[PDB]
Amino acid sequence: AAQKSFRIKQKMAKAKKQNRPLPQWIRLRTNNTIRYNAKRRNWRRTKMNI
Amino acid sequence: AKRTKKVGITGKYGVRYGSSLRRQVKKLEIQQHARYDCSFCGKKTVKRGAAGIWTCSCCKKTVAGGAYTVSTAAAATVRSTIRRLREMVEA
Amino acid sequence: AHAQSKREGRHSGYGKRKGTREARLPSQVVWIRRLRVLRRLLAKYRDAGKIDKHLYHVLYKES
């Protein structure tokens, strides 16, 4: 909603900061196992349930 | 002209609910929607606000009375015997 | 042009009315116009002095 609480807006801000791909220099580290962001979230496919 | 022969105020009910019930509500609705003489100002201004509340439009007095009449016969005879017993308690 | 012809009186027969006469013009507002006219005229005549109050009262009642 537009008139929202600060707790909800803070969780929304954290989700906006988390919604990003990998920094591609991480695939260059030795003994790297991470290929992509498996915890990626889109607003059309899954809801935060908050 | 005279629009209805006998239903009177109960013509708003149409053909419903039965004639013998419409007769009772006629006899009571005439009483609760009639005007009455104010015993204080002397005018024909007393009207029912709610069941038991009879207020005068002129003098703004409000009397507790019957549900459909301003005074019931039981209240009248109680007032009479109370007056008589008050007159008797000195004698 | 249609409003001009209607003001002049065309397009008003029975084949052009789809609502009742009361729906087109209420008999209540016709009566209200009539009563206001009569009461206004009676007050004008009384305040001009062409009629007295005793005639004005019975004319008010039968109007």
Partner: protein, 251 residues
Amino acid sequence: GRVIRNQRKGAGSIFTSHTRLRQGAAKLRTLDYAERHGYIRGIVKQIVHDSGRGAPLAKVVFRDPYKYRLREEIFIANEGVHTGQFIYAGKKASLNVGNVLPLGSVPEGTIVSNVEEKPGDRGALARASGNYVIIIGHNPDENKTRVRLPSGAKKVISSDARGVIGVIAGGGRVDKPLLKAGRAFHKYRLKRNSWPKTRGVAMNPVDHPHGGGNHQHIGKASTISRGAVSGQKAGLIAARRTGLLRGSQKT
């Protein structure tokens, strides 16, 4: 079987009385000192309608004898009380319609209302519209007055009990047919959720003792013992007799 409807009524979830539009409990003035040693005078400021009650209320204003202020008691209006009327409440009060004399100081045949059972409960008896209590007689020794209640019963209460002189206003209400489920709806809408009423014989046997069967019928006798338990008391509880009441009831 389920818990039946009259058994559910005591939990008071949706069966509480709707008390939003009520002016307060209509009680008598407290029997402090003036009412038992003399009288006190109040004034009827307004006679108002109370929701969910057939009788009108009267807002009587007294002066506090111990502090400079005004107290407002809510009486049930007796038939004939008007606004601006002076109400006299006490032992030395005069016998007039609206006064709150104790029952020891009224003669026989006095018509009173809003009568106390014990002195100090501020009105319990004869509070519905059109009802009244008659004083049958006195007992100076063993200071009790015998009274006839609206039910026809005869009680023996203290002569220090109080009562408003007259008849409760709003009488003759039930003499009018309601004519309509709508009117009954609006009547009960401000009292409580006790309307409409489904017959138990039209229910299922999980819902009522009378329910079930290929025809709508009660089955066993509808007269229930007083010693029955909750869930069974659906019918005529402890009926001494039944059927149409012919002749006088030998009251």
